[PDB]
């Protein structure tokens, strides 16, 4: 359920990172290799990919304007 800005050990982050530099955003298949390989659920890795992406942004949002 809704889970926070989850983190780990940089030994998890950094098989994560140096995938991230080949695709900036995965498909299922990778998040469930990613998932069967760290020990990990398909939705801890996503909120990482997706918080990765949002902090390479720093700001503003693709369906975001406020003006």
């Given at each position: 359920?809704?889970?926070?800005?989850?983190?780990?050990?940089?030994?998890?982050?950094?098989?994560?990172?140096?995938?991230?530099?080949?695709?900036?955003?995965?498909?299922?298949?990778?998040?469930?290799?990613?998932?069967?390989?760290?020990?990990?659920?398909?939705?801890?890795?996503?909120?990482w990919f997706q918080?990765?992406?949002?902090?390479?942004?720093?700001?503003h949002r693709e369906?975001q304007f406020l003006?």
């Open positions: 359920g809704r889970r926070p800005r989850t983190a780990f050990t940089q030994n998890q982050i950094e098989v994560l990172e140096n995938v991230f530099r080949v695709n900036c955003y995965p498909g299922i298949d990778i998040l469930e290799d990613l998932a069967q390989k760290l020990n990990l659920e398909l939705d801890r890795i996503q909120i918080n990765r992406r949002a902090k390479l942004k720093r700001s369906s003006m």
